Structure formats: structure tokens, C-alpha cells
Design a protein around this nucleic acid. Sequence first.
RNA 1: CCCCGAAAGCUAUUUAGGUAGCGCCUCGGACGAAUACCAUAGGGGGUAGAGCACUGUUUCGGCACCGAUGCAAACUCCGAAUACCUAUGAGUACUAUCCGGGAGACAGACUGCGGGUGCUAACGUCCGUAGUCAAGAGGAAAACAAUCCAGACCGCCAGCUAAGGCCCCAAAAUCAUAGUUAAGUGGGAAACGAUGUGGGAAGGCAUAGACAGCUAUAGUCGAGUCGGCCUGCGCGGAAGAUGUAACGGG
Lengths: 142, 57, 38, 137, 76, 97
Amino acid sequence: MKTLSAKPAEVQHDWFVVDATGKTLGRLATEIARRLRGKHKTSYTPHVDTGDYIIVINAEQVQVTGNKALDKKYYRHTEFPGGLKETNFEKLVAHKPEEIFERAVKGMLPKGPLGYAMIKKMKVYAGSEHPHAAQQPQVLDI
Amino acid sequence: KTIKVTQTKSSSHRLKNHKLCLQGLGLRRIGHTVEVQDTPSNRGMINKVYYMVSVEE
Amino acid sequence: MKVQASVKKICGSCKVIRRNGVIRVICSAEPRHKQRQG
Amino acid sequence: MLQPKRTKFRKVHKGRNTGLAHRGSTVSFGSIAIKATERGRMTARQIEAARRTISRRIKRGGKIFIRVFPDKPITEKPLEVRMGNGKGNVEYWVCEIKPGKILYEIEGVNEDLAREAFALAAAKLPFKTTIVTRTVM
Amino acid sequence: STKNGRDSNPKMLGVKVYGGQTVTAGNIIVRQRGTEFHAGANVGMGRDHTLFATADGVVKFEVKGQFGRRYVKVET
Amino acid sequence: ANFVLNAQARAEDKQGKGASRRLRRESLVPAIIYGGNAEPVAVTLELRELVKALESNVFFEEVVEIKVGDKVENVKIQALQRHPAKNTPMHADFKRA
RNA sequence: CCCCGAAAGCUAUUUAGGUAGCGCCUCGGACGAAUACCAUAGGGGGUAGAGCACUGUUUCGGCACCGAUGCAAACUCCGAAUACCUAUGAGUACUAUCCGGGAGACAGACUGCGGGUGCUAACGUCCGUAGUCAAGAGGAAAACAAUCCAGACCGCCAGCUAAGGCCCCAAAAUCAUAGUUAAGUGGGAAACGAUGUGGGAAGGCAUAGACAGCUAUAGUCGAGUCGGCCUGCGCGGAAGAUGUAACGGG
Ligand SMILES: [Zn+2]
């Protein structure tokens, strides 16, 4: 057993803060998902959560290119007959900016209990303030 | 006088005469290399299976 | 307004324009010449 | 309704339409002509419709040469019949068209009127066409 | 119903021995419905126009004569 | 003097179906010059030049100068092959005169 | 437990989902180079293509013939590539052949190529030919017998590659250089329609002044302008039933 697995009790979760002003949504989401999963650490282990905490500020300033602001559709289904509901990026970013990042990063994280645990380390906030000054996050430019 | 022939692709699904040409050159598996005389008779077999052999002169 | 797959000028007072990715024909003389491709 | 007066056999094999039209691709009767640029089948009804359109446009002021003749019979099964029990009955006649095949030539009219007539005729045909004129070689 | 549907059994005609081959007297060289080939030196003709060897040797095909006939012969 | 065609020599490695198709993809036209007292010569021409020359009727009756390298041949156009569908010139035969 | 390993064809059958002989498998014996691949050399052909000299068929002229012009599975004045037969030869290979013991099988499927049939329909049907499955695992294609790469004796927490890939789900380039697209085209479709945008060739008019507008060809105005051809990538044509549902998702 010369290749060792990371032990959850020895994992260190560091805190970082990221500004979303002017960033492209998907090209920011890939890096966020990578650091949430822990692919950037030499102790990476597929069955262990070794990632970091990511705070996102100015979430409503994220950008999309082309005509995606008006054309990119978000669907959901209540399980009643004919219960398909539809919105778009323009309305969703103005109303509930956290849902956009939640969808984007959820789609890029693994789909299981470990993925559900992984996505809890992302905190998304519309304004420029966050309530986690007690954790002393470092500025991360990605 | 002599040339080196290396087999580069599988022969399992090739034509019967193509497999027989490989066998008559003496090649047995992918990556196998043989050293054969430079004669028109050998060159005929080489040219027939040109698409899965590599020749070093 | 005629909505058709083939839109053409009919007289000299007709103009072919593109609005929002749709080809249209507008006539200054005869309103019945108005066409939309679709 | 062009159709052979007599045929040696009633029914023929389907065959395959391949190759270009090296023969019949030069202007030899009139001065201007219409030729196909895509292969296909030309039926007798299509030939007649195109001829009528051209003749009506040119008002019979010149001569029209038709260089396509439908000599290949096409069969069809009656309807609500199962597979087998022999080949079907002859229904209509076609001419095989290869790219380069000249269909109609016009002699003795102005080029503009001829092009108008050919443009009217092309809308009745199931394949793409082009206009050619007589050259020295 | 159809009025067709008949055919005859195959007859297996054709050239049996080609040029350059060695034959023994009596070997059949050509099976043919008509005289597509004619008999040359050391070659005999049967009642159904079969061409056969009448000596031991080597078969040779050629074209000769004023009519341009195709001949087969056996060289000893 | 009125009609001059600039040509390059067509060597044996530039003859055949594949070489001719490569030349026509390169927008050149193979051609052959034959006639009395000499051996045939294979040349390649420019499609633009050939089409420009063929647009005029006096090209089919005058004596034209084909220049390949330094040598010059005084020839008359003898035959021309065209694509059956696209009418593009494909090959030319010139007779020494 | 170890070794080899098919067939779903031909012929006949009150035969058609049975059976028999042959073809294909296995075991024993005999006999070795008689075998195959490839290279040279000899040989016949009537297909692909082509053509109108025969047989038919077709159009336009001239006076049944004559001149221009097409077509053909059951037409041929012509005519390949392949394939097939034979002889000699190098190299490589446990190859051919003969005599006996035991069989199984005689419902095939898909794909490419050449065809008949059908509607140039069908995951349709009937032949020829090759591959795979059948009786074959692994990797690619979202999932997917028959497609692509490749033929699993057993073990390894070693390395190189094939098809296919390298932003995240998910291993590997947010690699480099030069262009194109603005349609999420990419990531479904036709005839046809259109000053969408690249590239190329040629032509017409023009600082003795061109196009448009303006003033009743003259006149201010001060550079390019006009119309077609070839070609790259795009646009419309484009309506369905449980739920986005025609990039696997983000
Ligand atoms: Zn109008």
C-alpha cells in the first residue's frame, strides 16, 4: 500500500474570496469546481473531499457572451401535468443570482453524496459584502 | 542487399492473400521486425501490404 | 402582408430590407406589395 | 407525350445512372441551349410541360429542338398487392439524365427572349440546369 | 400469375486447357456449341464440335488464314 | 505576335490521371504540341490565359506563339476538351504551323 | 483440467423446422516439399467503359437512300482493370496428398461493394463477393450482437502506443501560428428566395469631373462608382402530441 489516500481528519480547508465582476460564467465555474473538488492539491483523492472554501461576491455582475443573456433558458418541472416552468438568464441574474452559480457548478461537480458535500463549500453573494470575515479569506484572482 | 520490415497494424481482418504475404515475409505480430533479402519476389509481398508495414532500407 | 418563402420586388417602388434577420419587401406606392419571408 | 412506337421488350431492369454526358453535351442545332448540371430522371410529362412553356414564351417565332427522348419504361405494382407474383405493369416513360445533357435548343430568336423562356422552363424540371451558347470549339 | 419461370441446366462449356500447357493424346481442349475455335495440327474435332488432342505435346492458340479463324494446335 | 501563351514543360512525372488532376486543382491546363518534322512536346498552360484567349474568335484562325523557357513554338489551336457539366477547358491540342 | 474446433451450403426426398451423399470439424496411420504466398513467362475471354458496323429504337434537315444527332439486360465494329489456368524461381511457413475411427450441421444476421425484385421504400426480399457476430472478451461511438481499433494462459499500485481524444462531470494542451463564422451555425432536411459576410478573375463609366440627392440635358456637389461570373462560411423555407428532450450534461 505504498500509494496513500488522504485522511479526512488531516484535510485542511482554506478560505478564498473571488470577485465575479466581468468574468465569463463558465470559465469561472470550471476553476471554482476544480478548487472545490481539490484537483489543485498533490494529496487529491477521488473519494475524499480535499477542496477549499470559495466565497463569490458581486454575483450579479457575471457575464455571458453572444445573445445568451436573452436566449439561454432555465427550465424546471413541477411534477404536475403540464408543469414545465421556464425563465432566462436576464431575469434570473436580476432576481436570484445564487441559482445561476449553483446550477453552473453543480453541473460540473460529481453527482453523488460526495458532490453534495463538495458544493456546500461555495458561498455566493449578490452584493460586495460577505458575512465570513471571521474565517479570514484570502483574495483569489481566477 | 537486405531490408528491415516492421508490422505496424493488425492483420486479423485483412484479406487472405494479405495475411499470407505477411506470413511469407515472416512477420508475426504488431511491432515485429524482420530482415529479408532485397529481391523483386520479396518486394512484391511488401508492396501488397504496404499499408500495414514500414520499410527501412 | 404576404408571408411566403419567395419574396421579390414587384415594381420600381419596392425595397428589399433586412430587419432582425428577416427579409422583407416594402412598397412605397402599393401597400398590397408588402411581403415577409417566412 | 413522347413514347417509342415499338419496343423489342416490354419491361427493363432498373439499372444504375452513373457517369457524365460526354455525348450530347455540345450545341449542334440552335444557337442557345439549356443543359442539366445534375443527374436525374426526366419524364414524358415533364418534357411536354417544358416544351409547352418554351413555345408559349417564344410565341413560335423560332425553332425548338428537343434532344431528350424517353425510351425507358417504368413499372409499378397495382396497389394493395404483396411482394412477388411477377413484375408490375408499365406506367410511364423516362429518359436518363447525366450532368452535361443538353435538353432543349432554340434557333432564330433574340438571346434575351430565349433566356426568359429557358428560365420559365427550368422551374418545371426536377434537376438543376444552366444556359450555354454555340462556340467554335 | 406469371408465364415465365423456366430455364435449362448448365452445360459447363469453355476452354479446358490453355496455351502453354502440356497435354496427352485424348485430352479435351475446348468445349463449344459452335466452331468458335478450329482444329489445327494434331487436334481432332468431335461430333458436337469438341476439340481434342490426338498427340502428346504443348497447346498453342493462334489466328491464321484468309477468314481470320481462331486455331488451336498441339506441338510435339 | 497577337497571341502569346506562357507555358512550362510537363515532364514524365507530371503525366497521367493523378498528375493531371493535381495540375487542374493547381489551376493549370495540360496541353500537347505535335506536327510535322518534330516529336510531340507536352506543356502546361494557365487557365486564365487560355480562357482569355478562347474568348476571341481570331484565336482559332491566327498563328499563336507558345513560349516555354527560351524556346518558342508557332502553333495553331487544333483541339480542345471541356468539362461536360462546367464547360471548363481541360486539355488542348496544338499543331505546329 | 488440457488441446483442436465447425455449419446454417450443394444435390435428392409426400420434401421444405426430418433425413441421406458431398462440402466444412476432430483423432490415428502413411508420406515429405509433391502445397501456398510473391516475382517473371505463356494463355482464353466479351463484363466496366465505349460505339452505331448488325438488330431495334430517336430527333432535325435533303432528295427507301444521303447528311448532322441520341439510346439498349436479352445490340456489338471495339474493349480494360481484376479474376482464372499453366511453367520456372528466391525467401518464409508443419504445407499439400492418400487410407481409416467419431461427429456436428443442412432457421442464419448485419455492414461495404456488383445486381434482380420493391417506390434507387423498409432492421423488406433473392443471388455473388469480403468482413464481423454467430462461437469473441478489452478500448472508442452517451447508452448501442453485426461499425472502428484490437484477438483475453495466470499475476504486478511498471512502461509505449492503436481507434479516439486533451475547459469541468472525466485521464491528457484553457498549447502555438494563420484565417473564417455571429447563426449557439457548430449540435437534423429540399426546390427556391435574399444589398449577410471572406476570397478571386474579368468588364463598363470617372477630376475635359462618374452614382444618389438637390436646382429648371445645363447647374451647385468633389471619388470612386455600376452590373454580372467562380468560390469559403452563414440566413429564411422549418408545425405534434408526458417534461427542457435534434452537443450525454454543465
Ligand atoms: Zn411595389
